[PDB]
Automatic annotation (TrEMBL):
Belongs to the MYST (SAS/MOZ) family. The chain holds residues 2 to 61 of 466 of the full protein. It comes from Trypanosoma brucei brucei (strain 927/4 GUTat10.1). It is found in: Nucleus. This is Histone acetyltransferase. It comes from the Eukaryota.
Amino acid sequence: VMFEVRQKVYATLHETFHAAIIQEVAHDAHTGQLLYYVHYVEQDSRMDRWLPGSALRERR
């Protein structure tokens, strides 16, 4: 499963899934893996972080 910029997702944060949105996508050169800069919808920008796809779920 792939995710896109502005896609609504669920993202783990301290072992809990929270509604989030993907702000940016970037390819980690060394392992080719896609990493996503997620913003938690009900948290401050400070909580924004880079996460692998294994931490994300579709939200709809």
